[PDB]
Point group: C7
Chain length 137, copies 7
């Protein structure tokens, strides 16, 4: 099932990095196998309420822990295929005192790199880029 | 069922982009078929509690991840048919220091494009347009 | 049941717009018929846990998506029958830098229209009008 | 049961307005009768899981929609019997730039009316009065 | 059971006001009797799912409504036995522009009374006193 | 079981104050005995759904009420064994206008005491110390 | 199972500190053994609903209490393998008035240490480093 999940993530374009793709495929395969094993164990008569409760609590805790990284990855996926944010475009993010000015040099799944006027490298999180006034000159 | 969902989204006007419409139709059809298969499997006697718990946890996590994009799409759908926000209207969004001034040029489902006085293209998220003082001159 | 729901929304005064009233009546009738059909299907023995879980997840996601519009509609309903906010009253909303000044010209279920001193049309969301210091001169 | 609920709300002092009291009594009576009917229907064998799920989802959505009005009403109920906020007392609410100055003239369940020095009528929400530094001169 | 709850709240020191103590005792006794009656009704065979769902929804709504008052009461209970906040101590609460300066005169379960330099009576909520920099001179 | 819980809290180092330790031990012992009694009552056939629902609602309400105190205690436990925050260290907490300057004199589970330059005693909550830029000179 | 969990945390790289690794391994082993014992007890017929409810409530309360520490640890894990934040790099975190300037000297799982120009040691939480504009000179 690992190969099937790898192919699915490759085709759907959710994850492009090979290492992240492999990790996600392994995690998904393990989760599916665990769910199937729990269902099979519950079919024959063995109680599964404590196991389900513990698994759900742990999964909810882990998901709440990874909220920022998940939001950043979702923003990176959504912002893909945007004409304004392209290498060589002098973009400007933010309104008021919290302003960011520079030129796009590279895109990542956790940060957006902008080259300042003095040469400093700015790491703007994609979540902040999503919920802000993006000005393209 | 894919064709039926495509027709429903076309008629109801929730989604107008053909690619987004096709993707939503495929996702909805897959979800409905999965729910029907799970119900059928639970009918004969096979336990479905772990499968339901895992599916619900994953769905909740994904839905919480896509909160910003969902809110933006809802704002884009709601703001449709508004007289103030039309091409050629010199609108002004925001009060205080966080002010945005320009002329509407194009509307998207993720951004609202305003042409500044100097020519810079402003990308105002529709969610911010919803919860702000919109001034039309 | 559509006619009964239409009459109920008309008499209770929750929704006054005919199009919104018809849409709400259709949605409510469909939801009630779906719930009755699901209950009938569960009565005879067919499992309904996956169907209920999927329906609840989808309903919760949609309800969370429409939070801003729902809040605005609730504020519009509540603010009805207020003496301060009436056509021709020079109201003033907000304290500090985020101040709004003008004369009320028209009321909507999504915006409150104020005519500025220079003639600009202000669209103040009803939710912001609810949770702010409203000054009537 | 409507008369019993009306008497209970009258004696307990939660609601004093006759129209609000009648509306709350009718809503409570309808809810209790619906719950009893659902319990009776579930007693004989008819499945009630879809009905309970739909009713709970709708009730949660409506309760979340009315959060601001509920909070304002609770603040109005709690602030009752306070010596500082009485007609003729030159109170002052807020610290910093968001300050409100005036004399109390009337009290409502949704707003607190203060007469400014120039004669403008201020409508301070009771929720803001609860969570603020109230200065009485 | 009312007397037992009254004695328990008196000994545990959670509530000291006789009227609040009596009200809490009555509410707790009613809740316990209702829970026992519901359990007894469910023991013999009568369905209790709709009753439990309605009671839980109503209780959750009421608890969410009273969040501010509950937080204030908890802060008042916790801040008890603090050396800094005592009658005659020139305390100072807040940092930056939102500063409060005065002398403690009396303590309540909803407000903290400070006498300003000019004689104005300040009502600082206990929740704000909990989460702020308290400066004692 | 009270002695066992007291020993466990003593060894694990979560609670060091003897009075808090005794109170926590008593509460934990009572909760465990109540849970065991409820499980035993449910084993023989007596319905426990209303009792479980009421207990869960009350526990959730109480836990949400004590959120600030719980967070402060957790911050106090976590910050233990930190070299920067020690008696005699001229620490500085906060950035911008909300700055706090002084010397550490004593540590508590609810406040952090700093001696100002003029002699005023500052009570900085541990939660604010956790989520702030701590500057040690 | 303690050794297996220790090996798993060592290989997966989630926890590198030996003491934290041992504590996490012990906690995970205890939780798994408790869940298995509860499932076995529920298999034979003994009711487990009160035990599951109490365990879930306690686990949720503890998880909500440790939210800040969990977020900080997740940020520390995610930020690993970042080129910008390395010893000897003059980084700058924050935009506007809340700015932090210094040179990275050491990295921890709870704080990020920066050496100021005057020699003061800055403790920037990793959570704030995640959601901020990181400027590398």
């Amino acid at each position: 099932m690992k190969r099937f999940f790898n192919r699915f993530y490759l085709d759907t374009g959710i994850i492009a990095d090979p290492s992240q793709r492999s990790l996600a495929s392994r995690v998904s395969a393990f989760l599916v196998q665990g769910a199937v094993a729990f269902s099979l164990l519950g079919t024959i008569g063995v109680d599964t309420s404590p196991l389900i409760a513990a698994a759900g609590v742990t999964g909810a805790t882990i998901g709440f822990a990874l909220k920022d990284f998940g939001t950043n990855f979702v923003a990176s996926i959504v912002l893909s295929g945007q004409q304004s944010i392209r290498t060589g475009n002098l973009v400007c993010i933010g309104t008021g005192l919290n302003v960011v000015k520079g030129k796009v040099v590279d895109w990542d799944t956790r940060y957006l790199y902008l080259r300042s006027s003095e040469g400093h490298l700015l790491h703007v999180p994609n979540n902040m880029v999503l919920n802000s006034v993006v000005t393209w000159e």
